[PDB]
Amino acid sequence: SGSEAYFDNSKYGWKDVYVYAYGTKENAEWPGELMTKEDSGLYKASFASSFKSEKIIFNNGLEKGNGKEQYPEAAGLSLKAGECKMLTAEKQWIDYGKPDDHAYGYTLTANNTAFSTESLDVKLALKNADKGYYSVDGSAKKEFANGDSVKVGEGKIGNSKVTLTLYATGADGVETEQTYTFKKTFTASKTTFSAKSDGHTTAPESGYYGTNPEMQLGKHKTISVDGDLSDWDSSMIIAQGVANDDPRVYMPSSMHEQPWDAYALYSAWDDDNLYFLLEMANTTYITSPEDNFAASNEARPWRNSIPMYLALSIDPAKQATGKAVGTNKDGSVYTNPFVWGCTNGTAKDGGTGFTTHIDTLVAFDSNNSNGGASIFKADTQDTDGTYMFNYDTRIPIGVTSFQAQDNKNGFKIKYANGTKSTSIFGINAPKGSRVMGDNLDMNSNWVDFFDEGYKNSYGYVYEIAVPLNTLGIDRSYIETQGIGAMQILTYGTSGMDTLPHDPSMLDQANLEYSYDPSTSHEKEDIDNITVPLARIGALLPDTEVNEAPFEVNFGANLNSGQSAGTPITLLAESYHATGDVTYSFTVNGETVTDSCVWTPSADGTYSIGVVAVDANGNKAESTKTFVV
Ligand SMILES: [Ca+2]
Ligand SMILES: [Ca+2]
Ligand SMILES: [Ca+2]
């Protein structure tokens, strides 16, 4: 009955260990209640079954300015009724058997840990027993004792799961098992590129992010601005983002808020229009369905009128900071820090500025009801050589009336539910656990949400046509000189998400919104774009292109440690190859079409490998250890 928390105090050295529980209930006023030092040396605390969902903070009880220590420093660690966990000397929150008197094998690495090394050394331990057994990827049971280790992932191909079951028997004779899952990740290098002349100071984000992936610069094609996506395909994506990286996810409990989650930007052009498709995701259905509003079509972006922006670079030399300029009826010049800000209903601070070069701002709104929608040009130079967006020359694209959807000067916009991508990658960690930077870490808990129940109707799409004559260009300019684009999303003023993604969208994501500390400050702060725009039509002249090399991801389908006579499938996949790839598998250097089966007869430690050669003689090799 209830739950248990254990604390390893061997490194902290606190004289008294306190535990503070908050969630379904609060055990006591901070610093909390005193944990019990056991014979194990561990400190233990127990919570009744009413404490159904809690977060745990360990501290030494002393006050600020008198030697206060605590862990974690911010949110607590998750503990639900029925669970039993321990904070290790290495500060890992790990399962520790169950809250009973049985024996259990456990790992000193947290369950479901991802890793990109060739193996993860997991230490094993026993609760209420002194001998156990383990099986890895269904291997024969093997003895183990406290301190022993298992090379999780060793010998395996990358991007694969590992299953590890620990068996234990206590003094009550109950045999128990604990099954653990780990993922070995593999990340191929991607061809990236950047040009100094655009004034960018932050590299384009990679991993799951990508700017102009595979040198996709959009495609020449007439697009039908309806709500239908049959005229687009993946090859036209110019900026790939990720799902569930919008600011709200970094708050302790902000999944009730409407998402602003940009997933992907596509572009095309003909002789009349520049075209865009924009994908937005809504993974609340999967992450937090208890939040009814957010995990519903009530969170569709056109529910209200929210500003959106396509920022373009037409003349590449011009650098517009976002500042805006205009003239009164009496001729006097005025300036604003952004084209829109505290404007009409919006009484909120915030905005997005630009270090990367832009000179044009397509300023529209999320339900296409703002009659003031405009295309601004930075056509007026400031004293510092920067350019300012001009109210006096703005091209109006707004509707005359919301019901007519009759935008001026040729601007077309249609929005709808839907999803063009067939995969929706994003981190699916428990609410409140998100950490700054985890969108750049390949060992975060990444999932394809289509494998967790995502549906096409969950997401949202916008299809947009901007007439070339409203940008001062033609098709030939796009295809020989090229331009840059970025989609910005807001929640009223400040940016929230961009494609290409910019880190200033999340540099303050965990700070508190001034009007409601449960929601993110990113709604109201000042963003500053420093990544490269996505190119359309052609590359900037001084572009340095980093070509990813031809490489291979190789390994076994079962973890090292199988039994003799077990068939072991060796697998290989290649990346960035030219034409036909020829694989050549070996065991101890002895050769054994993209895979092959190897049955070892005798025990021992083997070297498995593959050499891969493509049609231009490019070679890639991998060699790994497999033990039986
Ligand atoms: Ca269409
Ligand atoms: Ca996003
Ligand atoms: Ca920010």
Ligand SMILES: [Ca+2]
């Ligand atoms: Ca912001």
